[PDB]
Design a protein around this motif. Structure first.
Motif, PDB file in Angstrom:
ATOM      1  N   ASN A  60       0.826  -1.204   0.000  1.00 31.82           N
ATOM      2  CA  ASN A  60       0.000   0.000   0.000  1.00 31.82           C
ATOM      3  C   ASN A  60       0.862   1.256   0.000  1.00 31.82           C
ATOM      4  OD1 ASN A  60      -1.499  -2.322   1.472  1.00 31.82           O
ATOM      5  ND2 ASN A  60      -3.149  -0.928   0.866  1.00 31.82           N
ATOM      6  N   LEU A  61       1.709   1.400   1.023  1.00 28.78           N
ATOM      7  CA  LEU A  61       2.563   2.578   1.138  1.00 28.78           C
ATOM      8  C   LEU A  61       3.386   2.814  -0.123  1.00 28.78           C
ATOM      9  CD1 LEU A  61       3.673   2.245   4.855  1.00 28.78           C
ATOM     10  CD2 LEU A  61       2.949   4.409   3.834  1.00 28.78           C
ATOM     11  N   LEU A  62       3.702   1.752  -0.870  1.00 31.96           N
ATOM     12  CA  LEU A  62       4.412   1.944  -2.130  1.00 31.96           C
ATOM     13  C   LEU A  62       3.487   2.529  -3.185  1.00 31.96           C
ATOM     14  CD1 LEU A  62       7.196   1.358  -3.600  1.00 31.96           C
ATOM     15  CD2 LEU A  62       6.116  -0.779  -4.345  1.00 31.96           C
ATOM     16  N   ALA A  63       2.347   1.870  -3.426  1.00 31.72           N
ATOM     17  CA  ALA A  63       1.389   2.353  -4.415  1.00 31.72           C
ATOM     18  C   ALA A  63       1.052   3.815  -4.163  1.00 31.72           C
ATOM     19  CB  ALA A  63       0.125   1.491  -4.384  1.00 31.72           C
ATOM     20  N   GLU A  64       0.626   4.120  -2.932  1.00 29.12           N
ATOM     21  CA  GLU A  64       0.389   5.502  -2.524  1.00 29.12           C
ATOM     22  C   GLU A  64       1.560   6.393  -2.918  1.00 29.12           C
ATOM     23  OE1 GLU A  64      -0.161   6.280   1.742  1.00 29.12           O
ATOM     24  OE2 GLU A  64      -2.071   7.242   1.254  1.00 29.12           O
TER      25      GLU A  64
END
Length: 230
Positions: free
Chosen positions: A82-86
């Protein structure tokens, strides 16, 4: 059998160093029963450190944002997806943002409102940039034909009317206008040439009013004759 699979997979995890890899392998030497655990744990430092690389290589973020993602990931290792996609989303929003903020053919209303529609809905950045670039082209062309010095205002507002009706022909309506411009330009500088006799001048007016395709060439010829008859 699981010791062999987990063994191979840990020996071919691409985003760990030899210290971590050989530490995990020594743990597999101690207690093979922890196999399915170790491998899991092992690869969960893979797609963590791999993540640390990607957020380290996004150029349209600043240091605060980057190492802020690094920190927020070292506190929650399981959200690396998630933190990557974001993060990889934010990269777009900023990349678009400054690219919108650096178009020299938009006033402050169009700036603040494109940018405001970016802060409001980032999912449409890809389009809001697009039509911005389009606009920045179109308006630019409007500023060029508006300052071509050899057109009567009927010709100007004719071209402007045509591109206002159809912005998809912008680059072709501009290149047309300039063309006519240059042609008419030559016309003026032929009639304001002092050392020509009216035979050559009348012939030039005729041949030019027939084939503007060689206008430039014609002009050059004229000037050279002007040099020879001084």
């Amino acid at each position: 059998k699981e010791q062999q699979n987990a063994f191979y997979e840990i020996l071919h995890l691409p985003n760990l160093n030899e210290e971590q890899r050989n530490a995990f392998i020594q743990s597999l030497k101690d207690d093979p029963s922890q196999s399915a655990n170790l491998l899991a744990e092992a690869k969960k430092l893979n797609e963590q450190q791999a993540a640390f690389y990607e957020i380290l290589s996004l150029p349209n973020l600043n240091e605060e944002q980057r190492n802020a993602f690094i920190q927020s990931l070292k506190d929650d290792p399981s959200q690396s997806a998630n933190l990557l996609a974001e993060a990889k989303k934010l990269n777009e929003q900023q990349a678009a943002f400054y690219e919108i903020l650096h178009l020299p053919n938009l006033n402050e209303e169009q700036r603040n409102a494109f940018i405001q529609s970016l802060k409001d809905d980032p999912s449409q950045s890809a389009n809001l940039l697009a039509e911005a670039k389009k606009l920045n082209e179109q308006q630019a062309a409007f500023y060029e034909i508006l300052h071509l010095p050899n057109l009567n205002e009927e010709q100007r507002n004719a071209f402007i009317q045509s591109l206002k009706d159809d912005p998809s022909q912008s680059a072709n309506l501009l290149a047309e206008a300039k063309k006519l411009n240059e042609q008419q330009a030559a016309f003026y500088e032929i009639l304001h040439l002092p050392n020509l006799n009216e035979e050559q001048r009348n012939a030039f007016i005729q041949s030019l009013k027939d084939d503007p395709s060689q206008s430039a060439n014609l002009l050059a010829e004229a000037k050279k004759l002007n040099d020879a008859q001084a």
